[PDB]
Each structure stands twice: as structure tokens, then as C-alpha cells.
Subunit: 206 residues, 4 copies
């Protein structure tokens, strides 16, 4: 659990995210909980030029290391951490299907049993607020209180978990649920869903 | 036909399934008929960390090897084997197009002549039941009686064949038929189909 | 222009076709004009196991080399050759978008100027006939008289050109036109097209 | 900033464009501002056969190097350069989503905040004119006056920036916005957009 090991994983997650196609228009950012704050990807540097030494440390006060610019979207990573004590890694991206559902400003209902992976019977969509602002941070914090992933209106997705591996895995799964919802919605509205009882069983089961 | 050779193929099938994009949200599982039961992928371990020694043997009684956890979805692999004596390999996944059609709870009609590859003029959709349960197992067994592949409502796909190569090939083909059906359905409903006589000829021909 | 060189290109075309994603459900077949007939891919062997020695020679009489099974779809490759004297290579596949348009049984109208690459203001859709039959062969021959590519109802695509490189290139381009047509048709019907005069200029220009 | 270094980047951009899937039906062309004109990809040669020595120099007068054929679409690259003094690289392609929106002849409205990357609250669609003509050149020049990217009706996309890296990045981003617009439009019309004030803030913020 040396900083550099955490720094490598973050980078490995960026590359993998792109591999899975979640990172289009190279807009994602990834962070891990560290000391009294977090380690996050910097702004500007395209993921393939990323070296361990580029990862930026931001403390609990919001002050980042001297001479390094953290991601322009860092404020809501800090909001995720303070909203979910159990969260140790955060993955943000603008995956296409997730983003299309967020433009429609709809939550993703229980169309598949795997919806329970985020903690409940849905993936909410937090209201729009300009990126990098405290108001956007509040919307995210409120959305993550009872869910591990949320869509952001006219923007994209935030998923948090206990480690980068699961966080990435969750982000990917929400993208699949997003694609499933858009594909069926184009055929029929509303889309058939599993009842709350049924999701209650799957949750207990997980 | 040593266990380890069968163990490698299972792994090669998982990797290939992912390559083809059938394994998104890393939820598939694969098994082969072996001795009095089957060899199946374990739960938990992400496919890229899979080694021959991870594959789990489950006997005809449902008892699995000590210290190894089989896939959480193993019960319906055993149901496939007991429902189709001729089946020697089973491929399960949550491919997106197949899953979208299963959410609509529709069977795939004869929109393409290749539909005959599964044994008839359609790919059925078995009713929803919580994963890992005996009730889901019954639904699958009934669906596979006269077909080699079936969709599972709000869930995904199961395809069985004489070996892993053909099983994987069939799974892939159903995913293509699923995509063809969703794409045309968004334009026109119902989608034009080939008559039963016509499918009767193609079957005799295959 | 040794047989083995032509045999390698055919194989390189199969691999490339798959690379581009035109070969899903591994159903394509490729041929080149040779001596008094053609060299074609065999049936059964999955493209990655293909070696030069697997390619089958079929003469003008329809008799193929002893001990080798040509593609099950060879008859319409021979029809293409006799219908278009200028054709030296034939590419057949079941690309998804092309196939979806063929299920709707519609020709692709002039929605993009590149439609002229196939020779006119459209990509026709030849009527359905059981695969491997002489009746299907007639439908194809008639469709290829004034076009270099045609869709086959409830089936797929056939594209022919002066060499494998251009044939593959044309097949790919028709798949793009197919995707463009399905995507816009889901929004508006009919889809806006370029006038015949306009296509007359582009043709003269090509 | 030797010619050969600029020649390599152009080639690296073609390969990367294809990698991202923006170059389907191999129809794109790329140029950089150089001396009194530009360096552009040649016509005919498929990108994988491209060597530095193939890149063609065209002067401000429209005269290209002896014995080398520049891209058939070079005239609008020269129009981009004379319309946007600040433009140093131009990327043109026929990406599928961009092209589908251009067939509908619609501009892409502010459905996502990243729309500001092209300079305003939209991505316009310039009217159709036969490729390679001066009339098409005029349409493009007018469209690029206040935007860095534009769709071309029944044709594709042109994006310009300060260097190849950003130009490619912009082209990619417009393709994502195009896909987001088509996907949501198939569900609801009109698609929800962010207000002009909101885009005014994001622009100031960028
Ligand atoms: Zn963002
Ligand atoms: Zn499952
Ligand atoms: Zn065929
Ligand atoms: Zn063009």
C-alpha cells in the first residue's frame, strides 16, 4: 500500500477503462482514498502519457501538491469520499450509454437483476450543475447516500467501491444496464421491470 | 480428454467469449460434461486470473470439490445436462442483445435462416425466477427440451452443444440474431419472418 | 499469380473481414476467379485453422477438387462470375447491418454519395430463396447485372470487384451505408436522399 | 518541425483515427499547415501502406508537388486554413454517427456540456455540395467561421485545431456527441438541452 503502488493501479484502471470503451472523448478521472485525502489523476495529461509521478495528492482541506494540477473534476471525488465512508476508490467517466440516459434525465429502473449491485432497485440521475462546482458536489453526495453509482444529468457517471477493481467493475456494469435500457426503451415505454420484492430477494441473496 | 485439457478449454472459451464481447459485466460461466457430473468455472475469480486448478468438479449429486466454490449459477448447468443427454458443453452469459430481448420477454422468431442452428423456428425466452434456484432450473430444462439455446427473462442466455467450440459458436450466433431482431423491431413491428415450411427445408438441409 | 499466392490472399481477406467485424457467426466465404473457374474457401474449417492447402478449386462445370468440400454457398459465387465478366473476386458475409436491412427487404437508397461506389443510386435487395440453390443463384445474377453489391433477403451480402482488396473494401462500405440507413430510419421515414442528377455527377466524377 | 516529422504525425493520426473507428470505409484525410500551404495525405494509398514520402505538399496557389496526387478532398482543407488562421491541423472523416446526423441535416444542439469544445452551443451542418468542388469549399468556410468542427450534409465531418492531437481529439468528441444525439432522438424529440446561459458559463470556464 505504498503511494506508488496505488499510483500504478490508478493508471492501470485508466487504461483498462479505455480498453472497455468507457473512456471516450478521454474525459474520465479516477481516485483512491489515501492518508487524509486521496490520490487522483491530473488534468491535461492524456492517459497514455501517465506515469506514477503525475498522480496528484489532495488533502482533506482541498489543497493539492505543489506544481501538480489535479483533475478538473476532483471536487466530486472528495464529495464521494465524505459521503460514503466505506468508499475507497472512485471512477468517473462519460461512457456513452450512461450519458445518453443522463440526458433524458431518467434513473435506470430494475430491468435486470444485476441492478442490485449498486445497492438498490435503481441507478439514480443527479440533477445538472456546472462541472467543478460545489452545487454539483452536493447533488452527487445526496445521490450516493444510498447507492454506489449515480448518473449525472447531461454529463456522465460516478461509481464508487472498496477498491479500484470493483469500482471499475461497477462502472462497467452500469454502462451495460444503460445500454440495455436505451435499447428496450426505443421499442417500448415503459420498459418491463422486476418488482421491489424480487429485488429484495436478490439483495439479500448478494 | 484429461481433466486439465478440459480445464484449459473452458478457460480458453471464457477468454474467447470476452474477446467476442459476449462476456460484459464479467458474468458468464462455462461447463463441460465430465465423469458423473461436470467441470465448471468457479465463482469470484475474474477470468484473467483463471488457472486450470481453479476449475471445479461437481458430481451428479450436486456436491462440489472441497475448498472450491463453483459458479453461483451452476444449478442450471446441471439442469441443461440432465435435460439434454446429447449436450456436452454449456455456455452461459449476459450478452447485451440477448438480454435486451429477454427483458422484453419475447422469443426470437425466424427472421434469418440461421435460426435453425438452435433446432427450430425460434429461440425461446424462459420465464424469470431468481438466479441459483431450483425453479429457474425447471424453466431452463423445459425450454431446452426442443432447443439448444434459450433466453432467460430479465437475465441472459444459455446455449448448449456437443463441445465448447460449437457451444460458443451457437451463443455468438444467438447474440447476432438478437441484435438483428432489436434493430429491425425498432423500425417495424412485427418483423418479417420466414414461414415454417421454409424453416422445415433449412432444417432438413442442415 | 500462383495458386498459393491467391490462396493466401483469400485467407488474409477472411481474417481481415473478421477484424472489421463483417464476419460474425463465422458465415462468410470468399473466392477469386482462377483458370476456368474459381478458388473458394472450404466449408467447415473455421478461418483461423485455414491453410493454403484448404482452399478449393471448382471448375466451370461445377466439379470441385477431390477430397475437399467447398463452401456450402459456392453456387452464387459461380453465378457472380458468370454474371459479371469483369468480377475477379467475390466476398460474401452476413454482416449485421446489411442483414438487418435485408430482413426489412429494402434496397439502400442514395443517403450518402458513396452509394455510387456500387455502380448506381442504390444497393438492391435480391428476393429470398433457400441457400445453396439454383433459384437463389438466379436472383443474385439478376441483381448483380448493374451493381457490384447486393443484399440477399433474410440472409446477408455479396460484393464483387476486380480484386480481393477492392471487394473487401466495397463490402465494408456497404455495411457502413447499411448502418447509416438503419440509424436514420429509426428516427425518420423516409430517409432524405440525394437526387438522381446528383448521383449522376458523382458517378461521372468517380 | 521538419517536414518528415510532420509527415509521420499525419500518418500516426490516420492510424489512430482508424483505431478509434472514425475511419470506416477508409475515407478520411488529414492535413497540417506548412510553409505557405499544407501537407496532406495522398489519394489512393490505403493508410497502412503510407510512408512519410507519400505525404503531399500543396502550396497557397493550389499547386501540388509533381508526381504526387493529394487527397481528392484537399480543397476544403485549404478552405479551412484560409477561414481559420488559428487552425494548424485539419481532420476529415466519414465517422458513422456524425454522418447519420448529417443525413438528417440537423445541427447537434447542447445536449452535453462538452459541446462547448467546438466553440459554442452547437455543431452545425453545412449544406450539401458535390465533393471536391469550390461550392462545397464555400459552405465549409462559412460553417467554420465561428466553430472548430462542422458536419457536412450527406457526407461527414471536418474538425480543425492547433495541432493534430487536439484536432483528432475534437473529431472523436463530435462523434461521441453525434452518437449521444441519435440515441436519445430515437427515444424523444426534441432532445433536452442545456440553456445558452449555461453554455455561456461552461465556455467562460473552459
Ligand atoms: Zn465529467
Ligand atoms: Zn446469469
Ligand atoms: Zn450466406
Ligand atoms: Zn469526405
Amino acid at each position: 500500500m505504498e503511494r506508488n503502488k496505488l499510483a500504478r493501479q490508478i493508471i492501470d484502471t485508466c487504461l483498462e477503462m479505455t480498453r472497455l470503451g468507457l473512456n471516450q472523448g478521454t474525459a474520465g478521472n479516477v481516485s483512491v482514498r489515501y492518508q487524509d485525502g486521496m490520490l487522483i489523476t491530473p488534468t491535461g495529461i492524456p492517459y497514455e502519457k501517465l506515469t506514477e509521478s503525475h498522480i496528484v495528492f489532495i488533502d482533506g482541506n482541498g489543497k493539492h501538491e505543489e506544481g501538480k494540477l489535479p483533475s478538473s473534476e476532483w471536487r466530486f471525488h472528495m464529495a464521494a469520499y465524505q459521503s460514503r465512508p466505506d468508499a475507497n476508490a472512485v471512477v468517473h467517466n462519460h461512457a456513452v450509454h450512461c450519458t445518453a440516459v443522463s440526458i433524458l434525465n431518467r434513473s435506470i429502473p430494475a430491468i435486470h437483476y444485476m441492478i442490485a449491485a449498486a445497492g438498490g432497485n435503481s441507478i439514480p440521475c443527479a440533477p445538472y450543475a456546472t462541472f467543478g462546482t460545489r452545487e454539483l458536489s452536493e447533488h452527487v453526495a445526496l445521490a450516493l447516500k444510498n447507492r454506489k453509482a449515480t448518473l449525472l444529468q447531461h454529463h456522465g457517471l460516478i461509481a464508487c467501491e472498496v477498491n479500484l477493481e470493483k469500482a471499475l467493475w461497477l462502472a462497467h456494469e452500469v454502462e451495460v444496464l444503460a445500454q440495455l435500457y436505451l435499447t428496450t426503451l426505443a421499442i417500448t415505454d415503459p420498459v418491463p421491470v422486476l418488482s421491489d420484492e424480487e429485488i429484495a430477494v436478490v439483495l439479500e441473496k448478494f
